[PDB]
Amino acid sequence: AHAFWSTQPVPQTEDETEKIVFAGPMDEPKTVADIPEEPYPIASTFEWWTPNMEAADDIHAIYELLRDNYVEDDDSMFRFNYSEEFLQWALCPPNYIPDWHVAVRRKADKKLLAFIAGVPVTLRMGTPKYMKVKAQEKGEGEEAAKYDEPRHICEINFLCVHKQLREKRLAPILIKEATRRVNRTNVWQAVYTAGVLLPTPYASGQYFHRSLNPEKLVEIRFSGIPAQYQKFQNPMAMLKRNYQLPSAPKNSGLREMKPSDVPQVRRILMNYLDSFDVGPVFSDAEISHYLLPRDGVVFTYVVENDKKVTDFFSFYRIPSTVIGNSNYNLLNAAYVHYYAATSIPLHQLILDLLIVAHSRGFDVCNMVEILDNRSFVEQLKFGAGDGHLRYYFYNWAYPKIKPSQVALVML
Ligand SMILES: CCCCCCCCCCCCCC(=O)SCCNC(=O)CCNC(=O)[C@H](O)C(C)(C)COP(=O)(O)OP(=O)(O)OC[C@H]1O[C@@H](n2cnc3c(N)ncnc32)[C@H](O)[C@@H]1OP(=O)(O)O
Ligand SMILES: Cc1nn(C)c(C)c1N(C)S(=O)(=O)c1c(Cl)cc(CCCN2CCN3CCC[C@@H]3C2)cc1Cl
């Protein structure tokens, strides 16, 4: 049923994943020297290209490919429009490997036809807590703990094939060449997410959405007017009233994050994320890169009291092109990023996130039900959406876990 994925080191069915008890690799052990030195063969009219994602025109080329060809909703009403500044941020974290950014161009005119990107991440991906309990009962604690040390792996994102080249088996070639380049760097696992169902997720979470500009969301058919609103004479004014938010944050001591906050934010974030079965481990440099504010891209606020950072939240911007409605070009979405609360309830912290996002002109706040995101859904008027985000490993057997045991945000 899967001419490509059946040949790959991933669990092949849900029934197989249901039987996995310990974390660990799936493929035969290999070394860098076993991996082909030469790029994977591609047809003569095409060439491999490694873009320089710190060069403005290379970023712009990838930006255009994604703008016109990346993920759409199922009704082709919206398509992600990640900005050039966002792409540079997401693709060039500390110690990133340029060779892991893989493109295909038409050799004749250098037209960009396809892209896939990998970035390094340090991930805790050892056997989850519930399976360690079973392992202990069975005398298998050592094997269950074998791969507990955080692992330096690849995170894959931004797979895209031009619309005119679809269903020609180019995606498997891109994946194969990315795998080769990552393996040549002595890295053997990857983590990736998708909205679609592939073999075989270790976790899946529903998307949730918080209306910030409901009149726009209804107009573009992102949101509907619930049936119960028809019992009122003006359902739209009632809708706006329901979603209204304060004009300024409520938490005393909230301010934008600054460079000197990096060590404190690292400590509180790492203390929080260590409670989840799967999660990243961030250095100071990675905290700085992923969390310090960048205009139009990432927004991060801390709660400071007694000159100490006790809480923080972050969100990032991904607009989507509104394909079918001529009255609006873009849907401006804020996505919940990392956060940590030690002094206030999480719903009180995330209310300030919604306020800041609304004040800055965002139309909706999106998130997946990872981390403790479910704990503020009802209080802050998030609604479940149609979409899901499925989490996958390449070359890593892993038991099924709930999305609330996942602490890795994927951009
Ligand atoms: C150690 C290091 C390892 C590094 C790599 C780790 C693995 C990373 C894996 C990538 C993680 C990416 C994470 C994200 O970015 S998820 C976002 C994916 N991008 C989009 O949805 C953008 C719009 N769509 C496209 O650009 C294309 O339709 C794509 C590129 C998605 C498929 O192109 P096309 O439509 O022209 O099809 P084909 O004829 O070339 O190929 C068909 C084969 O492709 C399999 N397919 C379809 N969709 C996906 C998908 N989203 N992940 C993995 N495989 C997918 C499909 O099952 C079939 O295989 P099989 O069913 O026959 O077996
Ligand atoms: C406004 C809007 N624009 N677009 C393009 C869509 C679909 C919408 N919606 C309608 S949606 O409700 O907001 C929504 C929906 Cl249905 C489904 C999904 C499934 C995940 C898609 N990918 C896969 C690759 N990447 C991994 C990490 C981020 C990214 C997520 C995501 C969303 Cl974000």
DSSP letters spanning 359-409: HTT-SEEEEES-TTGGGGTTTTT-EEEEEEEEEEEES-B-----GGGB---
Token pair, residue 48, equals 């491999």
Which among 41, 43, 40, 62 has a CA at the least distance from the CA of 51? 62
Residue 117 forms beta bridges with which residues? Answer: 101, 157
> Is the minimum distance from the CB of 3 to ligand 1 under 6 angstroms?
yes
Token pair, residue 37, equals 């030195």
CB 338 within 8 A of CB 353: no
Which among 368, 23, 14 has a CA at the least distance from the CA of 193? 368
Phi/psi region, residue 73 (left: phi>0; alpha: psi -120 to 50; beta: rest), is beta
User: Which amino acid does the sequence have at 57?
Assistant: D
Helix (H, G, I), strand (E, B) or coil at 199: coil
Residue in this structure with the two tokens 């016109």, named with its chain if needed: 68
> Is 38 marked within a binding site?
no
What is d(CA 241, CA 245) in angstroms, rounded to the nearest whole number? 9
What is d(CA 61, CA 9) in angstroms, rounded to the nearest whole number? 32
> Ligand 2: distance of its center to the CA of 320 in Å?
9
Angle at 85 between CA 82 and CA 88, to 5 degrees: 95
Q: What number of other Cβ atoms are within 10 A of residue 295's Cβ?
A: 8
> Is the minimum distance from the CB of 175 to ligand 1 under 6 angstroms?
yes
Q: How is the chain split among helix, strand and coil, in percent rounded to 5?
A: 30, 30, 40
Ligand showing the shortest atom-to-Cα distance for residue 159: 1
> Ligand 1: distance of its center to the CA of 195 in Å?
11
State the pairing for strand pair 279-280/112-124: antiparallel
Torsion of CA 168, 169, 174, 176, to 10 degrees: -160
367 CB-contact burial (10 Å; exposed 0-12 / middle 13-18 / buried 19+): buried
> Is 159 marked within a binding site?
yes
CB 337 within 8 A of CB 409: yes
CB 411 within 8 A of CB 217: no
Contacts of 63 (CB under 8 A, 6+ apart): 82, 83, 84, 87
CB 273 within 8 A of CB 122: no
Contacts of 229 (CB under 8 A, 6+ apart): 235, 238, 239
Resolution in A: 1.5
> Is the minimum distance from the CB of 78 to ligand 2 under 6 angstroms?
yes
What is d(CA 82, CA 377) in angstroms, rounded to the nearest whole number? 26
CB 39 within 8 A of CB 49: no
Ligand showing the shortest atom-to-Cα distance for residue 211: 2
What is d(CA 248, CA 43) in angstroms, rounded to the nearest whole number? 57
What is the DSSP-derived secondary structure letter of residue 29? P
User: How does DSSP assign 108-160, residue by residue?
Assistant: TT--EEEEEEEEEEEEE-S--HHHHHHHHHTT-HHHHHTT-S-EEEEEEEEEE
15 CB-contact burial (10 Å; exposed 0-12 / middle 13-18 / buried 19+): exposed
Backbone angles phi, psi at 151, to 5 degrees: -115, 140
Q: Which CATH number does 1-411 carry? A: 3.40.630.170
CB 48 within 8 A of CB 39: yes
Contacts 24+ apart (CB under 8 A), 373-378: 373/208, 373/336, 373/404, 374/404, 375/346, 375/347, 376/346, 376/347, 376/350, 377/208
Helix pair angle (262-273, 284-291), 10° resolution? 100
> Ligand 2: distance of its center to the CA of 35 in Å?
35
CB 92 within 8 A of CB 62: no
Nearest CA to ligand 1 atom 53: 198
Helix (H, G, I), strand (E, B) or coil at 213: coil
Q: What number of other Cβ atoms are within 10 A of residue 195's Cβ?
A: 13
Give the ranges where 227-345 is alpha helix by DSSP (H).
235-243, 262-273, 284-291
Q: What number of other Cβ atoms are within 10 A of residue 75's Cβ?
A: 10
> Is the minimum distance from the CB of 196 to ligand 1 under 6 angstroms?
yes
> Is 292 marked within a binding site?
no
Which among 299, 314, 203, 315 has a CA at the least distance from the CA of 269? 314
Residue 397 forms beta bridges with which residues? Answer: 24
Token pair, residue 236, equals 């739209």
> Is 170 marked within a binding site?
yes
> Is 342 marked within a binding site?
no
Which among 58, 69, 93 has a CA at the least distance from the CA of 297? 93
> Ligand 2: distance of its center to the CA of 387 in Å?
7
Mutate to test the pocket of ligand 1, among 159, 318, 388 (most ligand atoms within 8 A of CB): 159
Mutate to test the pocket of ligand 1, among 161, 169, 177 (most ligand atoms within 8 A of CB): 161
CB 270 within 8 A of CB 282: yes
Backbone angles phi, psi at 383, to 5 degrees: -115, 140
Active centre residues (catalytic): 411
State the pairing for strand pair 330-341/364-368: parallel
Nearest CA to ligand 1 atom 46: 171
Helix (H) or strand (E) segment spanning residue 350:
helix 346-359
